[PDB]
Subunit: 198 residues, 4 copies
């Protein structure tokens, strides 16, 4: 079974950028809903798998992808943020971003464009392509996890569901996007980059 | 060509079930953004169709369905809501909700369950199947409209995008559902049934 | 594990309607490919499920839906056909078709229209809706199984992939559709209807 | 407005790798059906756009992308095939296939694997990413064209719909793949690279 992990900071440590009412809620409600549904569904999968029931397996695919991706997606999201966040990353990570996007600001503009373009619920991502050996930007719908659905390795993600900035920025998604860069834990993004730089 | 329709009531006429902020933001900011972007899209479309560009016609599709449906979907919504609605309809429409869904009991439950079940942004609909002559409950993702995508005639629709209840009801989608049944304009729901009960 | 079931007739028992070169091939090659992939994938599912790996689970969803649906779909397909097929069904099944589609020929025209309209690979289906208590016609893409993906109970299906009539009818799909009605095992379609008439 | 382009060679010029029947049927029956239905669709489109009908514009979309892309996809295909092609390209394009995919060895393998992997009807593509200035291997479902759906510039495309190899190669898709490499017009593949190597 899975569990809800604690945050590496407080519910209000991301203020004024990300409201505390949003943070506690995004964690305790939304993210918590995900892990339980994930556990219930996973067991309903074990029931039909041993049973040899393919119809049941297939019927359980959407719930499993939604709650499972919700789990995976948000878990990586928390570690991407930090009260000691913002600025430009350093070392090899910044060189890769330069080698692949020209500069840090060109990279910023694009991840902003891809996240602001998601119609309905989705996520903006910065991923490492293990095969071609370079960084890519991708957008995923609802809770579809980046790696499970694309093979790209998730370095940095931006939750652009309306429950992630509405209480604060309302229908204005670019304001939230302008702000998110000030709480980004580049320590972690580099950390995830070293693991797959293999 | 397309105009933001005026609400047939004041921004706070549906209070307490839907607070005045949500209606103002929904109508003014969201619905309006669809009209404005639909206009630019159809204009960009005449341009590509005119100079036989099929790659541009295809690339423009996502935006047209999104903004086009956003405008279609919300204009309906405003007419389905009303200060003096709620409860139950009057025989003919009720006579139908009866026969096709058991009773208003199970009809509410059916629509509530379709709406609550949407993963991410979407809508729950009570439509009319003009072939079969039967009522149907259909859920559309994002801003995909009933008719254009499924062929069903829209009678009553419930927006379940998070911008429709988050400020008030927050994370509890089902709370937004039990409360919406109060502002439902059964008079208008009936109006759509009649023009198609043929 | 799963296996390839034998046909309730010979590879040429459906001539002149369905070629024998098509029949043996559709079974021994296409259908056989499905069951093995189904078994390999199912075990790769058990590996990651016990491991608690959600990324792997999600990555294996498409193969599992395609080979699993391919298995389910074709298995029902064989029992739908018969050298002693064709004509109109009798008893309750025909009354239901009349009560839901007006007549047998109106039903025929529609299942023909839905199967001839599939763009790319897909299946035409006649299903029983357990909840609304009546027959419906639906079309599914590639190998997506009807019940697992819609809840409808599969009574009769028409494989409209190009590997199902090309050697014989070439790009002409309606000819194959005109012919398929002459080998339809209505004994079985009624049989599947009794089970869900519950 | 749209015309069925004439083949730049005889229906049997690519023999023995693609037999004369397949080319005749592909070009004459399939490709033609797309042109004819694309024309009727765009005409139906001007009509709905003209009288501000957004429901009809949306309902017409599936057909436009299907026939529109069918015409786009095949017209390319004919120019990518040729009596005297095969082997390897000449430096500039080869210089690129080298850098981005390792070597022609792994480039063939990469495209072959993308094509063989399609579930149902589709295409494998070698495109140009005009931002990154890099070559990319992309697979499109049904008749969804590269550019209109992904933004990549199409350089070389392999049809994997069953009507492209079934009469000859039958169920063995990979046999059709190893054989197609022989008729590949590297001269034309180069032609598309040049106009975009900017
Ligand atoms: Mn979230
Ligand atoms: Mn809305
Ligand atoms: Mn088949
Ligand atoms: Mn083709």
């Amino acid at each position: 079974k899975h569990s809800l992990p604690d945050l590496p900071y407080d519910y209000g440590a991301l203020e004024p950028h990300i409201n505390a009412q949003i943070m506690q809620l995004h964690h305790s409600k939304h993210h918590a809903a995900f892990v339980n549904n994930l556990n219930v569904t996973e067991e309903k999968y074990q029931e039909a798998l041993a049973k040899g029931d393919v119809t049941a397996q297939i019927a359980l695919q959407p719930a499993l992808k939604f709650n499972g991706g919700g789990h995976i997606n948000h878990s990586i999201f928390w570690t991407n943020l930090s009260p000691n966040g913002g600025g430009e990353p350093k070392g090899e990570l910044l060189e890769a971003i330069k080698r692949d996007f020209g500069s840090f600001d060109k990279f910023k503009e694009k991840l902003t464009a891809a996240s602001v373009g998601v119609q309905g619920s989705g996520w903006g991502w910065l991923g490492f392509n293990k095969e071609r050996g370079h960084l890519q930007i991708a957008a995923c719908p609802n809770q579809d996890p980046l790696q499970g659905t694309t093979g790209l390795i998730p370095l940095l993600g931006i939750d652009v569901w309306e429950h992630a900035y509405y209480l604060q920025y309302k229908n204005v998604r670019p304001d939230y996007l302008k702000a998110i860069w000030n709480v980004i834990n580049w320590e972690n993004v580099t950390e995830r980059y070293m693991a797959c730089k293999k």
